[PDB]
From Swiss-Prot, chain A:
Organism this protein belongs to: Homo sapiens (Human)
Disease: Complement component 6 deficiency: A rare defect of the complement classical pathway associated with susceptibility to severe recurrent infections, predominantly by Neisseria gonorrhoeae or Neisseria meningitidis.
Protein name: Complement component C6
Known partners and oligomeric status: Component of the membrane attack complex (MAC), composed of complement C5b, C6, C7, C8A, C8B, C8G and multiple copies of the pore-forming subunit C9.
Function text: Component of the membrane attack complex (MAC), a multiprotein complex activated by the complement cascade, which inserts into a target cell membrane and forms a pore, leading to target cell membrane rupture and cell lysis. The MAC is initiated by proteolytic cleavage of C5 into complement C5b in response to the classical, alternative, lectin and GZMK complement pathways. The complement pathways consist in a cascade of proteins that leads to phagocytosis and breakdown of pathogens and signaling that strengthens the adaptive immune system.
PTM statement from Swiss-Prot or TrEMBL: All cysteine residues are assumed to be cross-linked to one another. Individual modules containing an even number of conserved cysteine residues are supposed to have disulfide linkages only within the same module.
Location in or out of the cell: Secreted; Target cell membrane
UniProt similarity note: Belongs to the complement C6/C7/C8/C9 family.
Portion held of the full protein: 395 to 443 of 934
Native organism taxonomy: Eukaryota, Metazoa, Chordata, Craniata, Vertebrata
From Swiss-Prot, chain B:
Location of this chain's protein in the cell: Secreted; Target cell membrane
Name used for this protein in its record: Complement component C7
Biological source species: Homo sapiens
Post-translational modification as stated in the protein's UniProt record: C-, N- and O-glycosylated. O-glycosylated with core 1 or possibly core 8 glycans.
Role according to the record: Component of the membrane attack complex (MAC), a multiprotein complex activated by the complement cascade, which inserts into a target cell membrane and forms a pore, leading to target cell membrane rupture and cell lysis. The MAC is initiated by proteolytic cleavage of C5 into complement C5b in response to the classical, alternative, lectin and GZMK complement pathways. The complement pathways consist in a cascade of proteins that leads to phagocytosis and breakdown of pathogens and signaling that strengthens the adaptive immune system. C7 serves as a membrane anchor.
Disease: Complement component 7 deficiency: A rare defect of the complement classical pathway associated with susceptibility to severe recurrent infections, predominantly by Neisseria gonorrhoeae or Neisseria meningitidis.
Segments passing through the bilayer: none
Superkingdom of the source species: Eukaryota
Homology family: Belongs to the complement C6/C7/C8/C9 family.
Subunit structure: Monomer or dimer; as a C5b-7 complex it can also form multimeric rosettes. Component of the membrane attack complex (MAC), composed of complement C5b, C6, C7, C8A, C8B, C8G and multiple copies of the pore-forming subunit C9.
């Protein structure tokens, strides 16, 4: 996960002002599951 | 994957006598009788076939 939020404000006067926000978020989840069962039988009878 | 490889033997063996003392079956002896006494392979092949 990431949050990356930035904010800037500005004003100038003898009048102009800006207040501004931009921020972007990422999420990831990988999930893994695995199974392997192997087997062998021999039976030799006399 | 299964393999089953399986035998029951219960006539442990038979041993037939040697060719001298064996008794031929009547039809087999009849077919031998009718063999041509010459290499006519058609007849002997019909014998080996039967």
């Amino acid at each position: 996960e990431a949050k990356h939020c930035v904010r800037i404000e500005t004003k100038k006067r003898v009048k102009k002002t800006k207040v501004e926000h931009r921020c972007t978020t990422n999420k990831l989840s990988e999930k893994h599951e695995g199974s392997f069962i192997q087997g062998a039988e021999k039976s030799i009878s006399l | 994957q299964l393999l089953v490889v399986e035998n029951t033997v219960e006539v442990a063996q038979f041993i037939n006598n040697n060719p001298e003392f064996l008794q031929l079956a009547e039809p087999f002896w009849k077919e031998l009788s009718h063999l041509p006494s010459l290499y006519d392979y058609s007849a002997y092949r019909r014998l080996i076939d039967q």
